Amino acid sequence: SRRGNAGDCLANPAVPWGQGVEIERALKQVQVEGLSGNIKFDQNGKRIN
Amino acid sequence: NAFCSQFSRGVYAIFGFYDKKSVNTITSFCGTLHVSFITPSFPTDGTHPFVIQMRPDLKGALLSLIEYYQWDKFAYLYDSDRGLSTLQAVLDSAAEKKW
Amino acid sequence: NSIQIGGLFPRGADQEYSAFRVGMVQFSTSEFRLTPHIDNLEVANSFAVTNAFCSQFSRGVYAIFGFYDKKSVNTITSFCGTLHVSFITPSFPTDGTHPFVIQMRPDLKGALLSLIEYYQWDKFAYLYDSDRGLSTLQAVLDSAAEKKWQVTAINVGNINNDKKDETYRSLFQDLELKKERRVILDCERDKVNDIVDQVITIGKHVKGYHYIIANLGFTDGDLLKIQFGGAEVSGFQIVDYDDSLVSKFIERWSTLEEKEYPGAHTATIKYTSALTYDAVQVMTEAFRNLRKQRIEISRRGNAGDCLANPAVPWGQGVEIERALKQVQVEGLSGNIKFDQNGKRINYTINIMELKTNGPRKIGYWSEVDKMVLTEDTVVVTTILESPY
Amino acid sequence: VITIGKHVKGYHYIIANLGFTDGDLLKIQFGGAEVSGFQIVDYDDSLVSK
């Protein structure tokens, strides 16, 4: 769900909004095919296989 | 400038390119502000959260191709702009395999 | 006239922060003074650098002193390139003509290159760290081809703390099969103390080897444990203690308080702290020379934040770097002379070599002339007869 | 011996007392000098292992 306000990036100290953990985790689990070939991701984010 | 302006918009992910000058800038922010970044540029040495690399590695294919062609003496020409991580890999394998 | 400046200091930089205080106390003149406004941080994280640099620019200063790392150097050279705030630092010198940047550290490469032909080497190894950039490794391999060396360069910096002892024993036994009697090290203090301890434990400091610790502190780290092996050790240092102003400083430095000045009550001082003292003389030289030609640059108006769209400079900062680069004073290192870019010219490095008595000096180096071997025979009579 | 550097391959040492592994020994394990010694208490015995 979109939080609405985001604030300023240079907030001292700024606070992360803890939905981006669920964003990247689905991003790390993408298993599709593209022009290059098979696309498989490590939990680091490096392209494997 | 473009990072905080798009952070003001409240975006979900950021797509873009980086060079060796700005590579530390994105990795410092996306780890801090916990937003994802997806890129076709050259991948960083070491691990970084919140960064998805699209370009694969080239090291092992280079070390296979030199080994498949059975080389021991050659020359190497490099540009600084994409980092030096390929150079550091092939100089380590230079020591182990008598190059 | 309390000129307000800014400090960006890393954690664990205890000896340098006291060496910053000694210049602030001694070089404090009555006609003007300096307001520190110092914050602590981590040098590897650019976000805290992004936090602190826009913190001090939000207040608005005339100059900033601090330390940077390889992981944050382009954060600095982009901000001071854009926002026209001059910057002074003793860290490793950048490559490229970056405006608004003062390199207080001298270059080391040409002095390092000069020593190598002096021993007339041909084949050696080169252990390096990945933290001070790779400018030296690029410098030697470019010179390796055009003067026909055989260099085996091996990185060491990515080794974890838990598996040190197996990796170094894996490292030097690989060097032993190639008969590598000559090693050039290039690290900070803490790696050099770790590497030398593993050289001793495998027993590779007898008569027959040679070592070069290529950094500005040769007697900075511990050296006594390899004094008596037999392996000839050389190194580089700029801060010679034989100078009286240095000897005045050491006499002043030694008598100080531990809990007030952590790391002061010693006999020697590290070069990173030595330039920190020498930088405050250069900062105070600026605003003294600034008020001499009646140049008021007092931008008392509100600086505002750093995220301006578009960002705007303020042209009195051009006069600041005009004043900072035109500084020639004398400090612990010696003759401080600059370039239009911000580098250092006309300096001298003392080539030091290790003997059984301890550290010595076998000469100095310059830009104009190379390694000058200032240490500071029979006549045969016979007659020409065959086959003699 | 270590500080003057005299434990390379080529030397030999014998610590003639009943505790060979009693004192520290790791710091000259990796030199090259062959070191022997004497001990009576073998740990491989079960009553010792008990």
mmCIF file with all atom_site columns, all heavy atoms in Angstrom, chain B residues 20-21 24 28-29 32 78 84 88 91-92 95 98, chain C residues 45-47 50 70-71 74 134 138 152 155 178:
data_model
loop_
_atom_site.group_PDB
_atom_site.id
_atom_site.type_symbol
_atom_site.label_atom_id
_atom_site.label_alt_id
_atom_site.label_comp_id
_atom_site.label_asym_id
_atom_site.label_entity_id
_atom_site.label_seq_id
_atom_site.pdbx_PDB_ins_code
_atom_site.Cartn_x
_atom_site.Cartn_y
_atom_site.Cartn_z
_atom_site.occupancy
_atom_site.B_iso_or_equiv
_atom_site.pdbx_formal_charge
_atom_site.auth_seq_id
_atom_site.auth_comp_id
_atom_site.auth_asym_id
_atom_site.auth_atom_id
_atom_site.pdbx_PDB_model_num
ATOM 1   N N   . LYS B 1 20  ? 31.492 4.219   -12.874 1.00 0.00 ? 20  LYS B N   1
ATOM 2   C CA  . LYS B 1 20  ? 32.378 4.011   -11.736 1.00 0.00 ? 20  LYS B CA  1
ATOM 3   C C   . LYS B 1 20  ? 32.440 5.214   -10.806 1.00 0.00 ? 20  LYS B C   1
ATOM 4   O O   . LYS B 1 20  ? 32.967 5.091   -9.700  1.00 0.00 ? 20  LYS B O   1
ATOM 5   C CB  . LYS B 1 20  ? 33.791 3.698   -12.211 1.00 0.00 ? 20  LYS B CB  1
ATOM 6   C CG  . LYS B 1 20  ? 34.501 4.902   -12.775 1.00 0.00 ? 20  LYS B CG  1
ATOM 7   C CD  . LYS B 1 20  ? 35.865 4.548   -13.269 1.00 0.00 ? 20  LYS B CD  1
ATOM 8   C CE  . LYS B 1 20  ? 36.785 4.193   -12.124 1.00 0.00 ? 20  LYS B CE  1
ATOM 9   N NZ  . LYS B 1 20  ? 38.157 3.898   -12.615 1.00 0.00 ? 20  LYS B NZ  1
ATOM 10  N N   . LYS B 1 21  ? 31.949 6.376   -11.231 1.00 0.00 ? 21  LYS B N   1
ATOM 11  C CA  . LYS B 1 21  ? 31.977 7.538   -10.359 1.00 0.00 ? 21  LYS B CA  1
ATOM 12  C C   . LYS B 1 21  ? 30.797 7.544   -9.404  1.00 0.00 ? 21  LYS B C   1
ATOM 13  O O   . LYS B 1 21  ? 30.943 7.944   -8.247  1.00 0.00 ? 21  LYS B O   1
ATOM 14  C CB  . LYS B 1 21  ? 31.986 8.824   -11.185 1.00 0.00 ? 21  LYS B CB  1
ATOM 15  C CG  . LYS B 1 21  ? 33.366 9.434   -11.419 1.00 0.00 ? 21  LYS B CG  1
ATOM 16  C CD  . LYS B 1 21  ? 34.284 8.510   -12.190 1.00 0.00 ? 21  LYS B CD  1
ATOM 17  C CE  . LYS B 1 21  ? 35.685 9.063   -12.295 1.00 0.00 ? 21  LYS B CE  1
ATOM 18  N NZ  . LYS B 1 21  ? 35.707 10.342  -13.049 1.00 0.00 ? 21  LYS B NZ  1
ATOM 19  N N   . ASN B 1 24  ? 29.242 4.183   -5.969  1.00 0.00 ? 24  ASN B N   1
ATOM 20  C CA  . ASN B 1 24  ? 29.166 4.192   -4.522  1.00 0.00 ? 24  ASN B CA  1
ATOM 21  C C   . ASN B 1 24  ? 27.966 4.986   -4.042  1.00 0.00 ? 24  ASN B C   1
ATOM 22  O O   . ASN B 1 24  ? 27.472 4.742   -2.937  1.00 0.00 ? 24  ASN B O   1
ATOM 23  C CB  . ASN B 1 24  ? 30.457 4.766   -3.953  1.00 0.00 ? 24  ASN B CB  1
ATOM 24  C CG  . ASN B 1 24  ? 31.659 3.911   -4.285  1.00 0.00 ? 24  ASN B CG  1
ATOM 25  O OD1 . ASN B 1 24  ? 31.599 2.683   -4.219  1.00 0.00 ? 24  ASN B OD1 1
ATOM 26  N ND2 . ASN B 1 24  ? 32.757 4.555   -4.659  1.00 0.00 ? 24  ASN B ND2 1
ATOM 27  N N   . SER B 1 28  ? 25.183 3.343   -1.552  1.00 0.00 ? 28  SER B N   1
ATOM 28  C CA  . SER B 1 28  ? 25.060 3.907   -0.218  1.00 0.00 ? 28  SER B CA  1
ATOM 29  C C   . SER B 1 28  ? 23.624 4.285   0.105   1.00 0.00 ? 28  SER B C   1
ATOM 30  O O   . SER B 1 28  ? 23.219 4.221   1.268   1.00 0.00 ? 28  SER B O   1
ATOM 31  C CB  . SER B 1 28  ? 25.961 5.129   -0.071  1.00 0.00 ? 28  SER B CB  1
ATOM 32  O OG  . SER B 1 28  ? 25.801 5.730   1.199   1.00 0.00 ? 28  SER B OG  1
ATOM 33  N N   . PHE B 1 29  ? 22.843 4.669   -0.902  1.00 0.00 ? 29  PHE B N   1
ATOM 34  C CA  . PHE B 1 29  ? 21.503 5.179   -0.638  1.00 0.00 ? 29  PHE B CA  1
ATOM 35  C C   . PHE B 1 29  ? 20.479 4.058   -0.575  1.00 0.00 ? 29  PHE B C   1
ATOM 36  O O   . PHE B 1 29  ? 19.622 4.040   0.315   1.00 0.00 ? 29  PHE B O   1
ATOM 37  C CB  . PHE B 1 29  ? 21.103 6.189   -1.709  1.00 0.00 ? 29  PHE B CB  1
ATOM 38  C CG  . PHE B 1 29  ? 21.827 7.500   -1.622  1.00 0.00 ? 29  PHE B CG  1
ATOM 39  C CD1 . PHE B 1 29  ? 21.785 8.386   -2.685  1.00 0.00 ? 29  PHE B CD1 1
ATOM 40  C CD2 . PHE B 1 29  ? 22.536 7.858   -0.487  1.00 0.00 ? 29  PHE B CD2 1
ATOM 41  C CE1 . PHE B 1 29  ? 22.440 9.600   -2.623  1.00 0.00 ? 29  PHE B CE1 1
ATOM 42  C CE2 . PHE B 1 29  ? 23.201 9.067   -0.426  1.00 0.00 ? 29  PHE B CE2 1
ATOM 43  C CZ  . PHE B 1 29  ? 23.147 9.941   -1.491  1.00 0.00 ? 29  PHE B CZ  1
ATOM 44  N N   . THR B 1 32  ? 20.656 2.319   2.486   1.00 0.00 ? 32  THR B N   1
ATOM 45  C CA  . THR B 1 32  ? 20.154 3.156   3.567   1.00 0.00 ? 32  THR B CA  1
ATOM 46  C C   . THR B 1 32  ? 18.643 3.321   3.497   1.00 0.00 ? 32  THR B C   1
ATOM 47  O O   . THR B 1 32  ? 17.929 2.981   4.445   1.00 0.00 ? 32  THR B O   1
ATOM 48  C CB  . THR B 1 32  ? 20.821 4.528   3.533   1.00 0.00 ? 32  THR B CB  1
ATOM 49  O OG1 . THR B 1 32  ? 22.231 4.386   3.741   1.00 0.00 ? 32  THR B OG1 1
ATOM 50  C CG2 . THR B 1 32  ? 20.233 5.414   4.606   1.00 0.00 ? 32  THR B CG2 1
ATOM 51  N N   . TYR B 1 78  ? 43.276 -2.156  -21.155 1.00 0.00 ? 78  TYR B N   1
ATOM 52  C CA  . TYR B 1 78  ? 42.095 -1.915  -20.350 1.00 0.00 ? 78  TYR B CA  1
ATOM 53  C C   . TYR B 1 78  ? 41.743 -0.440  -20.346 1.00 0.00 ? 78  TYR B C   1
ATOM 54  O O   . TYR B 1 78  ? 42.612 0.428   -20.458 1.00 0.00 ? 78  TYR B O   1
ATOM 55  C CB  . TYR B 1 78  ? 42.291 -2.403  -18.911 1.00 0.00 ? 78  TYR B CB  1
ATOM 56  C CG  . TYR B 1 78  ? 43.400 -1.714  -18.143 1.00 0.00 ? 78  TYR B CG  1
ATOM 57  C CD1 . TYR B 1 78  ? 43.140 -0.610  -17.337 1.00 0.00 ? 78  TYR B CD1 1
ATOM 58  C CD2 . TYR B 1 78  ? 44.701 -2.193  -18.192 1.00 0.00 ? 78  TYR B CD2 1
ATOM 59  C CE1 . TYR B 1 78  ? 44.145 0.010   -16.632 1.00 0.00 ? 78  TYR B CE1 1
ATOM 60  C CE2 . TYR B 1 78  ? 45.711 -1.583  -17.484 1.00 0.00 ? 78  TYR B CE2 1
ATOM 61  C CZ  . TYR B 1 78  ? 45.425 -0.486  -16.706 1.00 0.00 ? 78  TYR B CZ  1
ATOM 62  O OH  . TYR B 1 78  ? 46.430 0.131   -16.002 1.00 0.00 ? 78  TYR B OH  1
ATOM 63  N N   . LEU B 1 84  ? 38.182 -1.819  -12.277 1.00 0.00 ? 84  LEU B N   1
ATOM 64  C CA  . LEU B 1 84  ? 39.384 -2.598  -12.519 1.00 0.00 ? 84  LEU B CA  1
ATOM 65  C C   . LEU B 1 84  ? 39.221 -4.043  -12.073 1.00 0.00 ? 84  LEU B C   1
ATOM 66  O O   . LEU B 1 84  ? 40.215 -4.767  -11.957 1.00 0.00 ? 84  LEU B O   1
ATOM 67  C CB  . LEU B 1 84  ? 40.584 -1.965  -11.813 1.00 0.00 ? 84  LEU B CB  1
ATOM 68  C CG  . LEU B 1 84  ? 41.332 -0.791  -12.455 1.00 0.00 ? 84  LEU B CG  1
ATOM 69  C CD1 . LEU B 1 84  ? 41.797 -1.160  -13.849 1.00 0.00 ? 84  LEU B CD1 1
ATOM 70  C CD2 . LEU B 1 84  ? 40.563 0.527   -12.457 1.00 0.00 ? 84  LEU B CD2 1
ATOM 71  N N   . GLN B 1 88  ? 41.939 -7.154  -11.795 1.00 0.00 ? 88  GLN B N   1
ATOM 72  C CA  . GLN B 1 88  ? 42.342 -7.797  -10.554 1.00 0.00 ? 88  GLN B CA  1
ATOM 73  C C   . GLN B 1 88  ? 42.098 -9.293  -10.578 1.00 0.00 ? 88  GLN B C   1
ATOM 74  O O   . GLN B 1 88  ? 42.835 -10.038 -9.924  1.00 0.00 ? 88  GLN B O   1
ATOM 75  C CB  . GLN B 1 88  ? 41.604 -7.171  -9.381  1.00 0.00 ? 88  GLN B CB  1
ATOM 76  C CG  . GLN B 1 88  ? 41.975 -5.732  -9.157  1.00 0.00 ? 88  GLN B CG  1
ATOM 77  C CD  . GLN B 1 88  ? 41.194 -5.111  -8.029  1.00 0.00 ? 88  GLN B CD  1
ATOM 78  O OE1 . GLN B 1 88  ? 40.324 -5.748  -7.441  1.00 0.00 ? 88  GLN B OE1 1
ATOM 79  N NE2 . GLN B 1 88  ? 41.497 -3.858  -7.721  1.00 0.00 ? 88  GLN B NE2 1
ATOM 80  N N   . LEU B 1 91  ? 44.952 -10.904 -12.904 1.00 0.00 ? 91  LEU B N   1
ATOM 81  C CA  . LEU B 1 91  ? 46.284 -10.868 -12.327 1.00 0.00 ? 91  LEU B CA  1
ATOM 82  C C   . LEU B 1 91  ? 46.440 -11.860 -11.191 1.00 0.00 ? 91  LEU B C   1
ATOM 83  O O   . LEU B 1 91  ? 47.558 -12.317 -10.931 1.00 0.00 ? 91  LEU B O   1
ATOM 84  C CB  . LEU B 1 91  ? 46.616 -9.458  -11.848 1.00 0.00 ? 91  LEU B CB  1
ATOM 85  C CG  . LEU B 1 91  ? 46.854 -8.513  -13.019 1.00 0.00 ? 91  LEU B CG  1
ATOM 86  C CD1 . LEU B 1 91  ? 47.042 -7.099  -12.532 1.00 0.00 ? 91  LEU B CD1 1
ATOM 87  C CD2 . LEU B 1 91  ? 48.064 -8.974  -13.795 1.00 0.00 ? 91  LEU B CD2 1
ATOM 88  N N   . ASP B 1 92  ? 45.345 -12.208 -10.517 1.00 0.00 ? 92  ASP B N   1
ATOM 89  C CA  . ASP B 1 92  ? 45.410 -13.271 -9.523  1.00 0.00 ? 92  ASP B CA  1
ATOM 90  C C   . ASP B 1 92  ? 45.609 -14.624 -10.184 1.00 0.00 ? 92  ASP B C   1
ATOM 91  O O   . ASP B 1 92  ? 46.447 -15.420 -9.747  1.00 0.00 ? 92  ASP B O   1
ATOM 92  C CB  . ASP B 1 92  ? 44.146 -13.273 -8.673  1.00 0.00 ? 92  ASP B CB  1
ATOM 93  C CG  . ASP B 1 92  ? 44.056 -12.066 -7.783  1.00 0.00 ? 92  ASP B CG  1
ATOM 94  O OD1 . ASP B 1 92  ? 45.121 -11.526 -7.426  1.00 0.00 ? 92  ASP B OD1 1
ATOM 95  O OD2 . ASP B 1 92  ? 42.929 -11.657 -7.439  1.00 0.00 ? 92  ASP B OD2 1
ATOM 96  N N   . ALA B 1 95  ? 49.177 -15.426 -11.361 1.00 0.00 ? 95  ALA B N   1
ATOM 97  C CA  . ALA B 1 95  ? 50.146 -15.972 -10.421 1.00 0.00 ? 95  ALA B CA  1
ATOM 98  C C   . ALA B 1 95  ? 50.006 -17.480 -10.292 1.00 0.00 ? 95  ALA B C   1
ATOM 99  O O   . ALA B 1 95  ? 51.010 -18.200 -10.239 1.00 0.00 ? 95  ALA B O   1
ATOM 100 C CB  . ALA B 1 95  ? 49.978 -15.310 -9.057  1.00 0.00 ? 95  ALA B CB  1
ATOM 101 N N   . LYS B 1 98  ? 51.012 -19.574 -13.870 1.00 0.00 ? 98  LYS B N   1
ATOM 102 C CA  . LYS B 1 98  ? 52.274 -19.254 -14.552 1.00 0.00 ? 98  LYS B CA  1
ATOM 103 C C   . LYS B 1 98  ? 52.020 -18.489 -15.859 1.00 0.00 ? 98  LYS B C   1
ATOM 104 O O   . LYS B 1 98  ? 52.174 -18.996 -16.973 1.00 0.00 ? 98  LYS B O   1
ATOM 105 C CB  . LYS B 1 98  ? 53.116 -20.523 -14.765 1.00 0.00 ? 98  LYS B CB  1
ATOM 106 C CG  . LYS B 1 98  ? 54.528 -20.292 -15.314 1.00 0.00 ? 98  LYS B CG  1
ATOM 107 C CD  . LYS B 1 98  ? 55.373 -19.441 -14.393 1.00 0.00 ? 98  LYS B CD  1
ATOM 108 C CE  . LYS B 1 98  ? 55.778 -20.209 -13.153 1.00 0.00 ? 98  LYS B CE  1
ATOM 109 N NZ  . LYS B 1 98  ? 56.705 -19.413 -12.306 1.00 0.00 ? 98  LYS B NZ  1
ATOM 110 N N   . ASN C 2 45  ? 30.724 4.770   4.627   1.00 0.00 ? 45  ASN C N   1
ATOM 111 C CA  . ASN C 2 45  ? 29.337 5.018   4.256   1.00 0.00 ? 45  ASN C CA  1
ATOM 112 C C   . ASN C 2 45  ? 29.223 6.417   3.668   1.00 0.00 ? 45  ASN C C   1
ATOM 113 O O   . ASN C 2 45  ? 29.515 7.406   4.347   1.00 0.00 ? 45  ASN C O   1
ATOM 114 C CB  . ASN C 2 45  ? 28.424 4.871   5.471   1.00 0.00 ? 45  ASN C CB  1
ATOM 115 C CG  . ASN C 2 45  ? 26.950 4.875   5.108   1.00 0.00 ? 45  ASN C CG  1
ATOM 116 O OD1 . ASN C 2 45  ? 26.579 4.955   3.940   1.00 0.00 ? 45  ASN C OD1 1
ATOM 117 N ND2 . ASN C 2 45  ? 26.099 4.799   6.122   1.00 0.00 ? 45  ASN C ND2 1
ATOM 118 N N   . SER C 2 46  ? 28.777 6.500   2.418   1.00 0.00 ? 46  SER C N   1
ATOM 119 C CA  . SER C 2 46  ? 28.595 7.802   1.798   1.00 0.00 ? 46  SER C CA  1
ATOM 120 C C   . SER C 2 46  ? 27.314 8.489   2.237   1.00 0.00 ? 46  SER C C   1
ATOM 121 O O   . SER C 2 46  ? 27.192 9.701   2.044   1.00 0.00 ? 46  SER C O   1
ATOM 122 C CB  . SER C 2 46  ? 28.612 7.676   0.275   1.00 0.00 ? 46  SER C CB  1
ATOM 123 O OG  . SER C 2 46  ? 29.892 7.280   -0.179  1.00 0.00 ? 46  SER C OG  1
ATOM 124 N N   . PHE C 2 47  ? 26.359 7.745   2.806   1.00 0.00 ? 47  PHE C N   1
ATOM 125 C CA  . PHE C 2 47  ? 25.132 8.364   3.294   1.00 0.00 ? 47  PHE C CA  1
ATOM 126 C C   . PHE C 2 47  ? 25.408 9.291   4.464   1.00 0.00 ? 47  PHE C C   1
ATOM 127 O O   . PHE C 2 47  ? 24.837 10.383  4.545   1.00 0.00 ? 47  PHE C O   1
ATOM 128 C CB  . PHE C 2 47  ? 24.113 7.302   3.701   1.00 0.00 ? 47  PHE C CB  1
ATOM 129 C CG  . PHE C 2 47  ? 22.851 7.874   4.279   1.00 0.00 ? 47  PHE C CG  1
ATOM 130 C CD1 . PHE C 2 47  ? 21.906 8.464   3.459   1.00 0.00 ? 47  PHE C CD1 1
ATOM 131 C CD2 . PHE C 2 47  ? 22.617 7.839   5.644   1.00 0.00 ? 47  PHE C CD2 1
ATOM 132 C CE1 . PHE C 2 47  ? 20.749 8.998   3.980   1.00 0.00 ? 47  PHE C CE1 1
ATOM 133 C CE2 . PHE C 2 47  ? 21.459 8.378   6.176   1.00 0.00 ? 47  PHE C CE2 1
ATOM 134 C CZ  . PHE C 2 47  ? 20.523 8.956   5.341   1.00 0.00 ? 47  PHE C CZ  1
ATOM 135 N N   . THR C 2 50  ? 26.874 12.074  2.961   1.00 0.00 ? 50  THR C N   1
ATOM 136 C CA  . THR C 2 50  ? 25.786 12.862  2.394   1.00 0.00 ? 50  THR C CA  1
ATOM 137 C C   . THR C 2 50  ? 25.025 13.598  3.489   1.00 0.00 ? 50  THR C C   1
ATOM 138 O O   . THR C 2 50  ? 24.575 14.735  3.292   1.00 0.00 ? 50  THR C O   1
ATOM 139 C CB  . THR C 2 50  ? 24.845 11.946  1.610   1.00 0.00 ? 50  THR C CB  1
ATOM 140 O OG1 . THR C 2 50  ? 25.617 11.149  0.704   1.00 0.00 ? 50  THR C OG1 1
ATOM 141 C CG2 . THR C 2 50  ? 23.849 12.752  0.803   1.00 0.00 ? 50  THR C CG2 1
ATOM 142 N N   . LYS C 2 70  ? 38.141 5.517   -0.273  1.00 0.00 ? 70  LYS C N   1
ATOM 143 C CA  . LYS C 2 70  ? 37.851 5.136   -1.652  1.00 0.00 ? 70  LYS C CA  1
ATOM 144 C C   . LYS C 2 70  ? 36.359 4.947   -1.874  1.00 0.00 ? 70  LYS C C   1
ATOM 145 O O   . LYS C 2 70  ? 35.843 5.281   -2.944  1.00 0.00 ? 70  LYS C O   1
ATOM 146 C CB  . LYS C 2 70  ? 38.577 3.846   -2.009  1.00 0.00 ? 70  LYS C CB  1
ATOM 147 C CG  . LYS C 2 70  ? 38.489 3.483   -3.473  1.00 0.00 ? 70  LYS C CG  1
ATOM 148 C CD  . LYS C 2 70  ? 39.077 2.124   -3.716  1.00 0.00 ? 70  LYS C CD  1
ATOM 149 C CE  . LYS C 2 70  ? 38.090 1.077   -3.243  1.00 0.00 ? 70  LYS C CE  1
ATOM 150 N NZ  . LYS C 2 70  ? 38.553 -0.310  -3.501  1.00 0.00 ? 70  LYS C NZ  1
ATOM 151 N N   . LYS C 2 71  ? 35.644 4.462   -0.863  1.00 0.00 ? 71  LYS C N   1
ATOM 152 C CA  . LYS C 2 71  ? 34.210 4.246   -0.996  1.00 0.00 ? 71  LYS C CA  1
ATOM 153 C C   . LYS C 2 71  ? 33.410 5.540   -0.943  1.00 0.00 ? 71  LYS C C   1
ATOM 154 O O   . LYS C 2 71  ? 32.185 5.491   -1.087  1.00 0.00 ? 71  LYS C O   1
ATOM 155 C CB  . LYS C 2 71  ? 33.714 3.297   0.097   1.00 0.00 ? 71  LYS C CB  1
ATOM 156 C CG  . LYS C 2 71  ? 33.680 1.817   -0.282  1.00 0.00 ? 71  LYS C CG  1
ATOM 157 C CD  . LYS C 2 71  ? 35.067 1.247   -0.550  1.00 0.00 ? 71  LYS C CD  1
ATOM 158 C CE  . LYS C 2 71  ? 34.998 -0.186  -1.032  1.00 0.00 ? 71  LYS C CE  1
ATOM 159 N NZ  . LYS C 2 71  ? 34.374 -1.072  -0.015  1.00 0.00 ? 71  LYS C NZ  1
ATOM 160 N N   . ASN C 2 74  ? 34.323 9.975   -4.594  1.00 0.00 ? 74  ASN C N   1
ATOM 161 C CA  . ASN C 2 74  ? 33.585 10.655  -5.644  1.00 0.00 ? 74  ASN C CA  1
ATOM 162 C C   . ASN C 2 74  ? 32.352 11.356  -5.099  1.00 0.00 ? 74  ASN C C   1
ATOM 163 O O   . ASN C 2 74  ? 31.794 12.227  -5.771  1.00 0.00 ? 74  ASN C O   1
ATOM 164 C CB  . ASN C 2 74  ? 33.209 9.661   -6.737  1.00 0.00 ? 74  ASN C CB  1
ATOM 165 C CG  . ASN C 2 74  ? 34.409 9.196   -7.535  1.00 0.00 ? 74  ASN C CG  1
ATOM 166 O OD1 . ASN C 2 74  ? 35.261 9.996   -7.919  1.00 0.00 ? 74  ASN C OD1 1
ATOM 167 N ND2 . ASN C 2 74  ? 34.491 7.895   -7.774  1.00 0.00 ? 74  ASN C ND2 1
ATOM 168 N N   . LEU C 2 134 ? 43.982 2.087   -6.646  1.00 0.00 ? 134 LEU C N   1
ATOM 169 C CA  . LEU C 2 134 ? 44.913 1.220   -7.346  1.00 0.00 ? 134 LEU C CA  1
ATOM 170 C C   . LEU C 2 134 ? 45.862 2.017   -8.224  1.00 0.00 ? 134 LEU C C   1
ATOM 171 O O   . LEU C 2 134 ? 46.390 1.491   -9.209  1.00 0.00 ? 134 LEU C O   1
ATOM 172 C CB  . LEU C 2 134 ? 44.155 0.177   -8.165  1.00 0.00 ? 134 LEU C CB  1
ATOM 173 C CG  . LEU C 2 134 ? 43.637 -1.081  -7.449  1.00 0.00 ? 134 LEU C CG  1
ATOM 174 C CD1 . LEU C 2 134 ? 44.773 -1.783  -6.737  1.00 0.00 ? 134 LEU C CD1 1
ATOM 175 C CD2 . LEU C 2 134 ? 42.458 -0.851  -6.500  1.00 0.00 ? 134 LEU C CD2 1
ATOM 176 N N   . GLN C 2 138 ? 48.616 0.578   -10.932 1.00 0.00 ? 138 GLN C N   1
ATOM 177 C CA  . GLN C 2 138 ? 48.633 1.030   -12.312 1.00 0.00 ? 138 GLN C CA  1
ATOM 178 C C   . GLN C 2 138 ? 49.927 1.738   -12.663 1.00 0.00 ? 138 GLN C C   1
ATOM 179 O O   . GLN C 2 138 ? 50.376 1.640   -13.808 1.00 0.00 ? 138 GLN C O   1
ATOM 180 C CB  . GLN C 2 138 ? 47.455 1.958   -12.577 1.00 0.00 ? 138 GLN C CB  1
ATOM 181 C CG  . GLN C 2 138 ? 46.120 1.261   -12.553 1.00 0.00 ? 138 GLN C CG  1
ATOM 182 C CD  . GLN C 2 138 ? 44.973 2.216   -12.767 1.00 0.00 ? 138 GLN C CD  1
ATOM 183 O OE1 . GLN C 2 138 ? 45.166 3.428   -12.843 1.00 0.00 ? 138 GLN C OE1 1
ATOM 184 N NE2 . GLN C 2 138 ? 43.768 1.674   -12.872 1.00 0.00 ? 138 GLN C NE2 1
ATOM 185 N N   . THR C 2 152 ? 54.752 -10.039 -9.927  1.00 0.00 ? 152 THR C N   1
ATOM 186 C CA  . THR C 2 152 ? 53.650 -10.894 -9.510  1.00 0.00 ? 152 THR C CA  1
ATOM 187 C C   . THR C 2 152 ? 52.865 -10.141 -8.446  1.00 0.00 ? 152 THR C C   1
ATOM 188 O O   . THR C 2 152 ? 53.220 -10.169 -7.265  1.00 0.00 ? 152 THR C O   1
ATOM 189 C CB  . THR C 2 152 ? 54.166 -12.227 -8.979  1.00 0.00 ? 152 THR C CB  1
ATOM 190 O OG1 . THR C 2 152 ? 54.970 -12.856 -9.983  1.00 0.00 ? 152 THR C OG1 1
ATOM 191 C CG2 . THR C 2 152 ? 53.010 -13.142 -8.637  1.00 0.00 ? 152 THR C CG2 1
ATOM 192 N N   . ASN C 2 155 ? 46.543 -9.355  -4.679  1.00 0.00 ? 155 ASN C N   1
ATOM 193 C CA  . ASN C 2 155 ? 45.729 -8.607  -3.732  1.00 0.00 ? 155 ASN C CA  1
ATOM 194 C C   . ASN C 2 155 ? 45.653 -9.386  -2.428  1.00 0.00 ? 155 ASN C C   1
ATOM 195 O O   . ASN C 2 155 ? 45.788 -10.613 -2.422  1.00 0.00 ? 155 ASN C O   1
ATOM 196 C CB  . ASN C 2 155 ? 44.329 -8.360  -4.281  1.00 0.00 ? 155 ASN C CB  1
ATOM 197 C CG  . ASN C 2 155 ? 43.584 -7.288  -3.510  1.00 0.00 ? 155 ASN C CG  1
ATOM 198 O OD1 . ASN C 2 155 ? 44.118 -6.699  -2.571  1.00 0.00 ? 155 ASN C OD1 1
ATOM 199 N ND2 . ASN C 2 155 ? 42.345 -7.035  -3.898  1.00 0.00 ? 155 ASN C ND2 1
ATOM 200 N N   . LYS C 2 178 ? 58.159 -19.739 -6.689  1.00 0.00 ? 178 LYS C N   1
ATOM 201 C CA  . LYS C 2 178 ? 58.701 -18.864 -7.715  1.00 0.00 ? 178 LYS C CA  1
ATOM 202 C C   . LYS C 2 178 ? 60.032 -18.249 -7.316  1.00 0.00 ? 178 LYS C C   1
ATOM 203 O O   . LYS C 2 178 ? 60.576 -17.463 -8.102  1.00 0.00 ? 178 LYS C O   1
ATOM 204 C CB  . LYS C 2 178 ? 57.707 -17.747 -8.044  1.00 0.00 ? 178 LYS C CB  1
ATOM 205 C CG  . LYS C 2 178 ? 56.631 -18.110 -9.061  1.00 0.00 ? 178 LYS C CG  1
ATOM 206 C CD  . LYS C 2 178 ? 55.513 -18.960 -8.474  1.00 0.00 ? 178 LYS C CD  1
ATOM 207 C CE  . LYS C 2 178 ? 54.436 -19.241 -9.501  1.00 0.00 ? 178 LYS C CE  1
ATOM 208 N NZ  . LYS C 2 178 ? 53.415 -20.182 -8.971  1.00 0.00 ? 178 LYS C NZ  1
#
